[PDB]
Amino acid sequence: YTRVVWCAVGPEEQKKCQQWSQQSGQNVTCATASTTDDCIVLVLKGEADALNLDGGYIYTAGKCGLVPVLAENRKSSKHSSLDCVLRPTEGYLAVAVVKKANEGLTWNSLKDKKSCHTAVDRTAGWNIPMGLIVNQTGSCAFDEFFSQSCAPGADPKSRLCALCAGDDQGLDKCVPNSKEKYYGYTGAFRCLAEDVGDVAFVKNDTVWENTNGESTADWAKNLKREDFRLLCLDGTRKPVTEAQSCHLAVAPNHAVVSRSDRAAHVEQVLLHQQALFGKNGKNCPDKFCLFKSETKNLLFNDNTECLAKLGGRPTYEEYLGTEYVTAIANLKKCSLEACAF
């Protein structure tokens, strides 16, 4: 069967995909859509084979028959004996971040402040935190908790999009793809670094990766970790070094999905593609790297050591686990077992 069609979300991911396609000698081809959801539709239709998804979307795709294939693994300290591809995934820490200078801002006084989310329907940027705020608040009016937000994917005319900037010309305001200045882990963090928002719902990795000269991007150049605090569920505020005892939840790694009838074929190609363009791939540093895109998290997260086999041939509910799956189901009662499309 041997040729995989990859689905890219928006213009910037399309261009990296074209490049990956070039260096692979057409072993991988690209289809493009303006949103993650449209990419999932394309995969159902059969017009694209696979894409990498945040847990939040895996839940969506899952209800539609798509299955996780391989997962992103970042370099861990424990489980050092095992090779990255066979090594179990650790998941990541959802956290809520704020400016240290913004004193007296805690989890208990988040109401009527300004929020930065990765995008609607994502784990750390939306489901985890809006899940908690609904339960704590006993109201489904999560669109009225924060005074203004940037929540890519929500109604552009709503308060949930008020803080989103769109692209260089200010078009595509709020679109849930990287054309939005404030989309995804980085976008949401920039949203805070620039004091557009009061809080940012991202992952622990995002604060480290974009502070203390890790980014060299113009807006992160001068960001110091020491100027940021984590918000914990007990009302306290801790340094970004204490993420292990001050997070909202641990989230299942982003995974590659596909139609079940296609999983095997997607898997074999992807494993070979990474032996060539992964971290120590034949042709990475020299010609092309699947896992670099200058802090921009295009196609895969920049901190991916490798894509890993799953083991236990899990179904999407097992991959995400019971915990998270009930969090999303509960939260989706505000916004009924069927494919969204």
Ligand X SMILES: *[C@@H]1O[C@H](CO)[C@@H](O[C@@H]2O[C@H](CO)[C@@H](O[C@@H]3O[C@H](CO[C@@H]4O[C@H](CO)[C@@H](O)[C@H](O)[C@@H]4O)[C@@H](O[C@H]4O[C@H](CO)[C@@H](O)[C@H](O)[C@@H]4O)[C@H](O)[C@@H]3O)[C@H](O)[C@H]2NC(C)=O)[C@H](O)[C@H]1NC(C)=O
Ligand Y SMILES: *[C@@H]1O[C@H](CO)[C@@H](O[C@@H]2O[C@H](CO)[C@@H](O)[C@H](O)[C@H]2NC(C)=O)[C@H](O)[C@H]1NC(C)=O
Ligand Z SMILES: *[C@@H]1O[C@H](CO)[C@@H](O[C@@H]2O[C@H](CO)[C@@H](O[C@@H]3O[C@H](CO)[C@@H](O[C@@H]4O[C@H](CO)[C@@H](O[C@H]5O[C@H](CO)[C@@H](O[C@H]6O[C@H](CO)[C@@H](O)[C@H](O)[C@@H]6O)[C@H](O)[C@@H]5O)[C@H](O)[C@@H]4O)[C@H](O)[C@@H]3O)[C@H](O)[C@H]2NC(C)=O)[C@H](O)[C@H]1NC(C)=O
Interface with ligand Y, residue 206, by CB under 6 A: no
Can residue 127 be called a binding residue for ligand Z (CB under 6 A)? no
Pairing verdict, β 114-117 and 148-150: parallel
Q: Which is nearer to Fe ion, 24 or 118 (CB)?
A: 118
Of residues 85 and 276, the one with the C-beta less far from ligand Y: 276
Contacting residues for 238 by C-beta, under 8 A, at least 6 apart: 229, 230, 232, 245, 246
| 122 assigned to a ligand binding site | yes
- Taking CB under 5 A as the binding criterion, the range among 3-11, 30-38, 116-124, 228-236 that sits at the site for Fe ion is 116-124
Q: Is 318 helix (H, G, I), strand (E, B) or coil?
A: helix
Burial label, 103 (beta-carbon count in 10 A; 0-12, 13-18, 19+): exposed
Separate counts of helices (H) and strands (E) for the chain: 9, 13
Q: Which does 205 bind (CB under 5 to 8 A by kind): Fe ion, ligand Z, ligand Y, none?
A: ligand Z
Instruction: Report the interface residues with ligand X, using CB under 6 A.
Output: 131-132, 135, 322-323, 326-327, 330
State which residue, 10 or 131, has the beta carbon closest to ligand X. Answer: 131
Contacts 24+ apart (CB under 8 A), 259-263: 259/43, 259/44, 259/46, 259/49, 259/65, 259/66, 259/67, 260/65, 260/66, 260/67, 262/49, 262/50, 263/67, 263/69
Q: Which is nearer to ligand X, 79 or 332 (CB)?
A: 332
Decide: is 243 part of the binding site for ligand Z (CB under 6 A).
yes
123 contacts which partner out of ligand Z, Fe ion, ligand SOR, none, CB within 5 to 8 A by kind?
Fe ion
Residue 301 interacts, among Zn ion, ligand SOR, Fe ion, none and using kind-specific CB cut-offs from 5 to 8 Å, with: none
Is 319 annotated as a binding-site member?
Answer: no
Task: Tell me the window of 92-100, 178-186, 233-241, 316-324 that interacts with ligand SOR (CB under 6 A).
Answer: 316-324
Q: How far apart are CA 26 and CA 340, in angstroms?
A: 32
The single-letter code of the amino acid at 155 is D
Quick one: which of 96, 99, 97 has its CA closest to 227? 99
Residue 121 is a binding residue for Fe ion (CB under 5 A):
no
State the binding string over 299-328 for Zn ion (x if CB under 5 A, else -).
-------------------x----------
185 marked as part of a ligand binding site = yes
Q: Binding to ligand Y (CB under 6 A): which residues in 23-42?
A: 24-25, 27
Q: How many residues does the chain have?
A: 341
Q: Pick the stretch among 14-22, 85-93, 158-166, 226-234 that binds ligand SOR (CB under 6 A).
A: 85-93
Alpha-helical (H) ranges within 114-262 are 128-137, 184-193, 204-209
Task: Copy the structure tokens of residue 84.
Answer: 């990255």
Asked if 123 touches Fe ion (CB under 5 A), the answer is yes
Cβ atoms of 316 and 61 closer than 8 Å:
yes
Tokens of 216: 């060299």
Q: Under 8 Å CB-to-CB from 168, ≥6 apart: which residues?
A: none
Note whether 54 binds Fe ion by CB under 5 A.
yes
On whether 3 is known to bind a ligand per the annotation, the reply is no
Beta carbon of residue 318, minimum distance to ligand SOR (angstroms, whole number): 4
- Report the interface residues with Zn ion, using CB under 5 A: 318
- Report the interface residues with ligand SOR, using CB under 6 A: 71, 88-89, 91, 252-253, 318-322
Q: What are the binding residues? A: 54, 92, 118, 122, 124-125, 185, 254
- Report the interface residues with Fe ion, using CB under 5 A: 54, 123
